[PDB]
Chain A
Amino acid sequence: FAPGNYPAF
């Protein structure tokens, strides 16, 4: 189950 949210820089 891969991460679904990489928050923007």
Chain B
Amino acid sequence: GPHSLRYFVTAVSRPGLGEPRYMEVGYVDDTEFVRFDSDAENPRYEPRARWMEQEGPEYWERETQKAKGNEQSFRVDLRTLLGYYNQSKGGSHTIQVISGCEVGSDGRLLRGYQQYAYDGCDYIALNEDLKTWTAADMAALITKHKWEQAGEAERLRAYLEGTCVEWLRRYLKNGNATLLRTDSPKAHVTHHSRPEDKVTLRCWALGFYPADITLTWQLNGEELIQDMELVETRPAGDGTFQKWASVVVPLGKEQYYTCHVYHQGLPEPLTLRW
């Protein structure tokens, strides 16, 4: 399937409490592999996945130097936006950026993106074409004009189409045993009694990778999608994921309901009943 390289950046001002909190987190697919945090004892870019041990000390030095530069850039950005939006220095504010590229199974580029947000709202975003920007409001329009007349989209397009894809491939090669693996879900159903003759059936799916999975309850063929209570797939702290889906049913008639689990580690979808 298609793979992705994502960098999540967040800058948070904290007036009185010093200079802003700055963090960068990188993901190859759903797996975290690099991190930077300004609050660390001594802030460095560092690995979060074992396979990144294959990069030498020159890699980590350059990433750290990049991050140090980016921190200063987002400090300025934070101060700039105070002027633009006419806000006081006493309040805390957040800038978030998501940047990445996605490649197909053959390693060729599918799409690239970068989006900025201020205090949780869309600020400025690169378009599908990778040539132009789109601004959410008038503060972002000022930024839009700065970036057009400096040719920022040209430098970013080069990074996304060239540099981003080339390193993603290397990460997929170096981390193949981790990134290209497939852990199958182990599933089971739990029974939970309730008032007024009802029963909650919960279908669990544990220890699977990658994260993409479908849980569904059925009754005589039809999928109970709207009547399902659900949680978003969630990491289990070891590079695997888990999920559960539940539905309320009448007492005694539990066997007529069935849970179906669709995952790429399951050549045939699981079907559990109780």
Q: Which residues of B contact A2 (CB under 8 A)?
A: 7, 24, 26, 34, 45, 63, 66-67
In the bound complex, do residue A5 and residue B77 qualify as a contact, i.e. CB atoms below 8 Å apart?
A: no
Interface hub of B66, B76, B150, B167 (most chain A Cβ within 10 A) = B66
Q: What count of chain A residues pass the 8 Å CB interface test?
A: 9
In the bound complex, do residue A4 and residue B66 qualify as a contact, i.e. CB atoms below 8 Å apart?
A: yes
Report if A7-B69 is in contact (Cβ < 8 Å); known contacts: A1-B167, A2-B26: no
* Interface residues in chain A, defined as those with a beta carbon under 8 Å from any beta carbon in chain B: 1-9
- 8 Å CB interface, B62-89 against A: 63, 66-67, 69-70, 73-74, 76-77, 80-81, 84
In the bound complex, do residue A7 and residue B7 qualify as a contact, i.e. CB atoms below 8 Å apart?
A: no
How far, in Å, is B28 (CB) from chain A's closest CB?
A: 11
Interface of B is mostly: helix
Q: Which residues of A contact B69 (CB under 8 A)?
A: 4-5
Report, nearest first, the 8 A-B pairs whose CB atoms are least far apart: A1-B167, A4-B66, A9-B143, A9-B77, A7-B152, A9-B80, A6-B73, A8-B76
Pairs across A and B, CB under 8 Å, 8 listed: A2-B45, A2-B66, A2-B67, A3-B7, A3-B159, A4-B69, A6-B77, A8-B146
Q: How many Å lie between the Cα of A5 and that of B61 in the bound state?
A: 16
Interface hub of A1, A3, A9 (most chain B Cβ within 10 A) = A9
Q: How many Å lie between the Cα of A2 and that of B167 in the bound state?
A: 10
In the bound complex, do residue B147 and residue A7 qualify as a contact, i.e. CB atoms below 8 Å apart?
A: yes
In the bound complex, do residue B99 and residue A3 qualify as a contact, i.e. CB atoms below 8 Å apart?
A: yes
Size bin of chain B's contact surface? 35 or more
Q: How many Å lie between the Cα of A6 and that of B115 in the bound state?
A: 11
Residue of A nearest to B152 (CB): A7
B164 CB-CB contact with A under 8 Å? yes
Q: Which residues of B contact A5 (CB under 8 A)?
A: 69-70, 73, 155
Q: How many Å lie between the Cα of A4 and that of B147 in the bound state?
A: 16
Q: Which residues of A contact B66 (CB under 8 A)?
A: 2-4
